[PDB]
């Protein structure tokens, strides 16, 4: 719910401003910003097939694409990134992911502890 | 029938969105140009305010005639460059009906391209890659070098612009240019001190750099003016057009169920 | 009495304002205009103007061309191609594009080419003693 | 008449260098700008 | 609906047909001078 | 109803359009309308999945750019995106090929290029490897060899 | 099926149009929707048969250009496609003709054009003689002696 | 099929963008009246004549009315010329020539 929410209304936007594409460099920062999380959201939606995942991975990738720590990349790494950083979740966080996992909600210290591990991730990203 | 309806409102669709992302664009584009518009008319107005209070008033029997027209390489304007080009073509007529040779100058493509099948016998030189980044000073002292270094030592010129009134209205103005021989052989001039030829020569060359810095930074927001109303205009049209075809396919629609069920029900009756 | 107008391609400094004296470098000379002077039009070189407001504070400014008209009625149209606040330029730059306008003219042969080099030259001596 | 005009130049030359000169001694806090709101984009026919 | 204009060969898929050919046949004049 | 029954009956369903017959390319492939049960990166490899996919990306973007072509004009794209229209139409010309029942037809030989040739080849026209060719050489050749040799002829003619 | 079936019965064919009714155009014939058999050069003429070809040909080419002027004005056309525009809108209205039996719900007296002076008026539309009339000049005449009457008396 | 294949290449190269003078050339060069079949021999000196450059010297107004003359002109002086195209099928390069001069001549007299 709480990352979903965001990431809906702003997937609404982007879908609203969507057609001034292959203009939008030429446009306000307001549209410019809406292009640009779409872009980056509708990049994080994209999934391969046979390969379900888990909703507590989910929620840290949706949280990793509306809280920001996607705009200054580029579109064609995203996908890049959303694997690489699934993987290192999975490997050095497993206490955060079985916490949210358990409780079903991401609590403060669970917010503050994805927002720790998404920006040293980003940190150190290629 | 149904499929070339929906094809042409699906081809109407697209048109209508096109338009609408083409008249924010030009919107964004007028934002700018009429912002970096007035710091420009005080420097283009102030530097003609010597001919005004010397009132300049160039020779009658003079022979040769410089005629520039300012638009742009960009279309979907309206009737920017048209304005242009018929202004052009009434001087040209008028001037060498009185026996002045006229050589003509296009900046921006589209006049070059629309006076180029007519008068090419009286051109000069032309200008492209006007339209897309706005202008600049650079822009107006190149085209004032390749005005200078052409050997074309003409005797009077005018320059044809689109000077722009409100987000609706441009106007086609006609602004004069003086020759050395002109400024230097008025009487008024001589309450000047501390003139020779020289600086009169470098004066009015920067004078030219000047009215066509002006000229382009007018017609520039004219001409952004005119493409938005445009845009709107074709979206508005292309909204018409969709709604009579959206009837036009609910009725069509309607029409394929009912014979469809027709044929069904009399194939069912002969049995 | 004397109505100034400064003004750039892209920014306007004056416009009709109320000055008491303005300082111009022109082609034949620098010269100082307070009202009532004789009308004159000249075409400028790089260096400073400034400008005296009817309070006494002055106003730099460094301009690399232009025009000037002081006319009958007291008014002064100072147009700049490149008008430019001292606190935009560096000593360092100018000196280092003085020094390589000096090895360039040293080395040209031709004769347009080498006033160009001696009018880069010119700009950035007068650059040089404008800024310090 | 000055020597660029002997040798054949014009003051809108003159004015190029003169402009150009002015901005290359810009710190570049404001040289990007300047070269941009300052250059040339038309070509010639 | 990507592509319906040119699709629906009207008086403006056409015109885009003719725009594309004019500016690759130019391209490719361009690009085989230099070749 | 029949074609539509049918299309469930199939492993890899191959859709030829009038429209692309009408532009000269042919076979008459739709490149956006023909699907295989095998084109799995897990059946096929990741290159050969990597190069079909970008190309029917690259062919998806064309038909999206065609639009504001028809109302813009050709000289108002980005240079990505005339980048992008560049690279589509040569995809295009290179999808075709040159059939061996066809020289009554068409006139020019028959080619039948192995798999990773056409891979090679498409993967780089992707790349940008050939930006400076002119489009038409792509069409109605085998392998990409043929493309730059068709290349260096017309240069030498034209 | 009808009007289908009936078409291969005929010798000519006078097909009236709503869309061209709605113009105000009476007779509402549409004239690239209406045949006829002698319609060939060696029955009316080459006279005859060239005027009514080129009619038909830049009535066709309007038809043609309608799009783009309905969505993109008419600024956005060159200067030939301009004149076929205004020839074939001053050849639309120069169709149009008042009927004595239409004089009774109309005020207009009815006109009985000679074969000859239709000729001779479309051709000389067609030349661009009348290119500086205005197109309101050919509505609800009979010969192109009354329409350029009506433009004298218009301006 | 020698002058056929080279005028359905140029005409689909001006359908693309509608080179364009000899693709009206050729559009106006396919026009024909009615009741008059032309003989095959005619019809390839006409396509030859329209699609080796000797038509976009003219407007394409005036081309059809060419076109008759250039009939009338050749069956009557060189009726040698379309018998061997009609004997032997094809055309030879010594009477490729020939009708190149014919042809050529025609259209400086033209």
Not at chain 2, 42 to 65: M, Q, R
Not at chain 2, 112 to 139: C, M, N, W
Not at chain 3, 85 to 112: F, H, I, R
Request: aromatic share 8%; net charge neutral.
């Amino acid at each position: 719910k709480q990352v979903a929410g965001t990431m809906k209304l702003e997937l609404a936007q982007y879908r609203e401003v969507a057609a001034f594409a292959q203009f939008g460099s030429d446009l306000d920062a307001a549209t410019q910003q809406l292009l640009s999380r779409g872009v980056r959201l509708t990049e994080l939606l994209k999934q391969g097939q046979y390969s379900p995942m888990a909703i507590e991975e989910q929620v840290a990738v949706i949280y990793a694409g509306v809280r920001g720590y996607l705009d200054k990349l580029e579109p064609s790494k995203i996908t890049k990134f959303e694997n690489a950083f699934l993987s290192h979740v999975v490997s050095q966080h497993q206490a955060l992911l079985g916490t949210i996992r358990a409780d079903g909600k991401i609590s403060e210290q669970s917010d503050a502890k994805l927002k720790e591990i998404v920006t040293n991730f980003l940190a150190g990203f290629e | 029938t149904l499929k070339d309806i929906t094809r042409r409102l699906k081809s109407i669709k697209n048109i209508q969105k096109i338009t609408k992302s083409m008249k924010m664009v030009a919107a964004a584009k007028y934002a700018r140009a009429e912002r970096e518009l007035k710091p420009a008319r005080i420097y283009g107005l102030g530097s003609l305010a010597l001919y005004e209070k010397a009132d300049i008033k160039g020779p009658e029997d003079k022979k040769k005639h410089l005629l520039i027209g300012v638009s742009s390489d960009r279309g979907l304007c309206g009737a920017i460059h048209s304005s242009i080009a018929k202004q052009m073509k009434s001087e040209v007529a008028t001037l060498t009906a009185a026996g002045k040779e006229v050589m003509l100058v296009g900046i921006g493509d589209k006049i070059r391209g629309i006076l180029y099948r007519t008068h090419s016998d009286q051109f000069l030189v032309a200008f492209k890659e006007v339209g897309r980044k706005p202008p600049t000073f650079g822009d107006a002292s190149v085209i004032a070098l390749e005005l200078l270094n052409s050997g074309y030592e003409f005797d009077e010129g005018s320059i044809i612009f689109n000077k722009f009134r409100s987000v609706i209205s441009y106007k086609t103005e006609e602004k004069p240019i003086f020759s050395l021989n002109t400024v230097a052989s008025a009487d008024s001039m001589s309450i000047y001190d501390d003139i020779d030829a020289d600086v009169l020569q470098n004066y009015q060359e920067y004078n030219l750099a000047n009215i066509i810095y002006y000229s382009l930074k007018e017609s520039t927001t004219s001409e952004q003016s005119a493409r938005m109303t445009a845009m709107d205009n074709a979206s508005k049209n292309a909204s018409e057009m969709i709604d009579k075809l959206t009837l036009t396919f609910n009725r069509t629609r309607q029409a394929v169920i009912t014979k469809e069920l027709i044929e069904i029900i009399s194939g069912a009756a002969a049995l | 009495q004397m109505s100034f107008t400064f003004a750039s391609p892209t920014q306007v400094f004056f416009n009709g304002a109320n000055v008491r004296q303005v300082d111009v470098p022109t082609l034949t000379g620098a010269f100082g205009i307070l009202a009532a002077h004789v009308p004159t039009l000249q075409v400028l070189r790089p260096g400073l103007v400034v400008v005296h407001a009817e309070d006494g504070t002055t106003s730099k400014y460094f301009v690399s061309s232009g025009s000037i008209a002081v006319n009958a009625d007291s008014s002064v149209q100072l147009l700049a191609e490149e008008a430019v606040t001292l606190d935009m330029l560096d000593l360092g730059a100018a000196k280092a594009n003085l020094e390589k306008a000096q090895a360039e003219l040293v080395g040209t042969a031709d004769e347009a080419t080498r006033a160009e080099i001696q009018i880069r030259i010119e700009a950035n001596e007068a650059l040089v003693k404008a800024l310090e | 008449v000055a020597y660029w005009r002997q040798a054949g130049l014009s003051y809108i030359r003159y004015s190029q260098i003169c402009a150009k000169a002015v901005r290359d001694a810009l710190k570049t806090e404001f040289k990007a700008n300047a070269e941009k709101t300052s250059g040339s984009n038309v070509k010639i026919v | 609906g990507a592509g319906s204009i040119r699709e629906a060969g009207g008086a403006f898929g056409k015109r885009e047909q003719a725009e594309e050919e004019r500016y690759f046949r130019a391209q490719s004049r361009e690009q085989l001078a230099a070749l | 109803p029949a074609p539509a029954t049918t299309f469930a009956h199939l492993d890899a369903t191959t859709v030829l359009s009038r429209a692309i017959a009408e532009l000269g390319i042919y076979p008459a492939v739709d490149p956006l309308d023909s699907t295989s049960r095998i084109m799995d990166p897990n059946i096929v490899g990741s290159e050969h999945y990597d190069v079909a996919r970008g190309v029917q990306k690259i062919l998806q973007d064309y038909k999206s750019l065609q639009d504001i072509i028809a109302i813009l004009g050709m000289d108002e794209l980005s240079e990505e995106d005339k980048l992008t229209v560049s690279r589509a139409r040569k995809i295009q010309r290179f999808l075709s090929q040159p059939f061996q029942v066809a020289e009554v037809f068409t006139g020019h030989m028959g080619k039948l290029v192995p798999l990773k040739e056409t891979i090679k080849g498409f993967q780089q026209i992707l790349a940008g490897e050939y930006d400076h060719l002119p489009e038409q050489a792509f069409y109605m050749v085998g392998p990409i060899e043929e493309a730059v040799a068709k290349a260096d002829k017309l240069a030498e003619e034209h």
